[PDB]
Design a protein around this nucleic acid. Structure first.
Ligand SMILES: Nc1ncnc2c1ncn2[C@@H]1O[C@H](COP(=O)(O)OP(=O)(O)NP(=O)(O)O)[C@@H](O)[C@H]1O
Ligand SMILES: Nc1ncnc2c1ncn2[C@@H]1O[C@H](COP(=O)(O)OP(=O)(O)NP(=O)(O)O)[C@@H](O)[C@H]1O
Ligand SMILES: Nc1ncnc2c1ncn2[C@@H]1O[C@H](COP(=O)(O)OP(=O)(O)NP(=O)(O)O)[C@@H](O)[C@H]1O
Ligand SMILES: [Ca+2]
Ligand SMILES: [Ca+2]
Lengths: 308, 308, 308
DNA sequence: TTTTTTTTT
């Protein structure tokens, strides 16, 4: 729902352009920002504020739904399969939409091999009537290889040009670019309404470790990180996409432990750990999930991505 | 792209000299440093900060590329061959640019024999139209021998004077010099734009083991090390060179294990282990690589470097 | 190369005496110690620290040399011959300066017979214009015999008094004395500038085996040892001497193996093994060397030292 | 909230 539906509610059209200057295009963007993010960042009068907060209430309802009539509103969620059959039974059918799925691993356990398989598998028609669409890949470690996507595209028998032209790409150079680029992701989702399906970020803490070193900067690091994860949760519901996030690990003297404190641990919905086993086999295990229990499976990082 | 393109964007020329006093010469140096590294280190003001961050946006784009149109931007990456044919098929053609390749070994497995061969092989025209250029060699163990480069230069039939005058050299005496010298490497790459090709460091952890001994100094050791590896990754993309890094090993009581924790293991792109086999034959094996699988080969440390 | 050249750079003369109280006499002693070894061991302000680190930069250059112009700076390295002709062709002319040469053996293979020959041979004029000088002998096993040096001094036809007065001697009683005595070696090299040539230690691990027994003290043993070997490498370049080190052996159930783990194996430059053969003949073999290949020779421990 | 070290007989 675009924002032009409010100028017929007595709002000036000049207020429509200034709401687009801060990054608000849809009517749910009004319902997520506070009154403090409009009054004290633009600097308008507070009579100018509730005139567009009253106009947003002449729309999608304020109130309550039953759990039964909400459950049929939850049918638009899809599941993007990962590439192997046992790994989908862990997650319940693959990587869920309207959520943040985080898969951390130690050193070589296939986290950019998993993100390269999803750049091909999310373009194919699959289970539940999922039609497939374009993909945005924000990079952090400089480990995206386009000719590695060719080795996976011949396993599913898809042509070379259709795979690489449906994958956007941008490298974030510092931790300010990781919050700069999320303005261009929200604008890219807004134009082609309903085409994009997946947003893959590589290691989100790969740039926070080196830009906020020490203990005197720990309080700012977990505050610039929490404002990013709340933005990723809002984008994932405003436009109905799936977010996949790679994480790193540290030791624990007093035995590993994921980087990022309780703030990354609470905001994430699904948590997977990849370990290394027999040769080219990896072992995946669910820590945190609202519905799936703790179980294990086995990968195979082959020449065509992740298999069995 | 030099930094003089911003004084035509209303910036004072006095701001150009103070940006050079902290080590920023190119326009990508602006795009990598934060706003906190300019405001809270140098004598500048807030309003003085976004005036040069707005001027840097009137340049190379912020936005997104497709993977297909990015793949032809990835043609400027080269590959420096190592000296033997089977060892190049492991890495995919040799040591890649825009990356950090780390080769660790146990005790005598040819790690300064491999770094002496690259001081000759990266000056010769080779595969993919790679023209060859100068080389910077930062030393840590005091094991660089100039008359050892003569024994390798006669194998490729190159004169003595042309080999030794295209190899710079500096010994780092302590772990502060390893971060001091990387200012002079960035200045040396900046003058002759496009001549240097390789940056070889010897054992980067040979000075961190003895300057930060104990467990009360483990937290500072892995924080001064992470700020160095992020600088090596930035230099390797700002000027399009290849970084080669030697590492040592420790035991593992509970069987070897490389020195340097998960921080060196994540920042490195390619990981090679050299073992000792039959006599003068060594055995190389890939652990970590974004594209190449785990396979093995065989060396021969001869009198002319590494052969077959 | 004394430290008085900094009081003409605005430094107080009272700072000159406190730098001598911690063992810094030459300008290269500033270039090897960190900023943490001056700030947190003396307890000065950190404005007092960079005032002498800026004053040390108005001196011998920071920067880069070519390999050709460095190769003529490597002409001051000498070679101390061992006493037999075939054993010098292994090492390339004898025991090199600016390095650490370690010769381990099993039980009776002539390691204090080799260290007694070098107490005479390093006082004689030899190849490459090497003039000969005084010798420091740190003992660990109580096996230095002065009247054994007389039997070797008549083979080279040198008088008795000139041999014994050019050999200093001190016995280290425990593993704290091995780090205590290296303060007096640095002071002895500093007074007669250019007279001393050799520093012979006997078995450096003969006192670390008995003072750190167990596995609960293995982590401290290899950390007090690594701080000693980095001090021996720094002294060997600060004053241009040669270091010779004797080592012991252990078994290997799962066949011998040298005592001292990967830390002694990496810091050592040249590694020789002495085996026993036909009667009074021994067999020497190179393991680790940056330039010489693995080859064998034969000794003869005669009544006048090592011969052919 | 952050960060792994180190072979013996
Ligand atoms: N095409 C391929 N076929 C088979 N195995 C591969 C292939 N590419 C990579 N591998 C293996 O996959 C592992 C590396 O995968 P990768 O996704 O890079 O792990 P990673 O965790 O991302 N590395 P890092 O970023 O440092 O944590 C190594 O074991 C490689 O040998
Ligand atoms: N003057 C000499 N003439 C001939 N043989 C000698 C003489 N002195 C010692 N030896 C022999 O040399 C061997 C001892 O040499 P030595 O250098 O002490 O070995 P070592 O390894 O140092 N002993 P250790 O310190 O316990 O390992 C024995 O075989 C002696 O018999
Ligand atoms: N010119 C040469 N010809 C043949 N073999 C050689 C030559 N120079 C060295 N070697 C051998 O190469 C090995 C040493 O190579 P080197 O690169 O020093 O290993 P390294 O791992 O760097 N040693 P380290 O630094 O302690 O780990 C030994 O086996 C030597 O015998
Ligand atoms: Ca990765
Ligand atoms: Ca002895």
């Amino acid at each position: 729902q675009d924002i032009d539906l409010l100028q017929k509610h007595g709002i000036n059209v000049a207020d429509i352009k200034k709401l687009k200057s801060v990054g608000i295009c849809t009517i749910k963007g009004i319902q997520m920002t506070t009154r403090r993010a409009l009054c004290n960042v633009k600097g308008l009068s507070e009579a100018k504020v509730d005139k567009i907060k009253e106009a947003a209430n002449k729309l999608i309802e304020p109130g309550f739904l039953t759990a039964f009539e909400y459950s049929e509103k939850r049918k638009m969620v899809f599941h993007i399969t990962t590439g192997s059959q046992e790994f989908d039974k862990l997650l319940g059918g693959g990587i869920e939409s309207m959520a943040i799925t985080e898969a951390f691993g130690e050193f070589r356990t296939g986290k950019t091999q998993l993100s390269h398989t999803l750049c091909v598998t999310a373009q194919l028609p699959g289970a539940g009537g999922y039609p497939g669409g374009k993909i945005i890949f924000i990079d952090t470690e400089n480990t995206f290889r386009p000719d590695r996507l060719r080795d996976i595209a011949d396993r599913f028998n898809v042509d070379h040009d259709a795979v690489l032209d449906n994958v956007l790409y941008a490298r974030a150079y510092t931790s300010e670019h990781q919050m700069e680029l999320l303005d261009y992701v929200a604008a890219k989702f807004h134009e082609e309404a309903g085409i994009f399906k997946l947003l893959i970020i590589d290691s989100i803490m790969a740039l926070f470790r080196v830009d906020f070193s020490g203990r005197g900067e720990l309080a700012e690091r977990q505050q610039k990180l929490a404002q990013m994860l709340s933005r990723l949760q809002k984008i994932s519901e405003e436009y109905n996409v799936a977010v996949f996030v790679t994480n790193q690990m540290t030791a624990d003297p007093g035995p590993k432990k994921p980087i990022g404190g309780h703030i990354l641990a609470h905001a994430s919905t699904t948590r997977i750990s990849l370990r290394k086993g027999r040769g080219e086999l990896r072992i995946a295990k669910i820590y945190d999930s609202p519905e799936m229990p703790e179980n294990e499976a086995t990968f195979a990082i082959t020449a065509g991505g992740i298999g069995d």
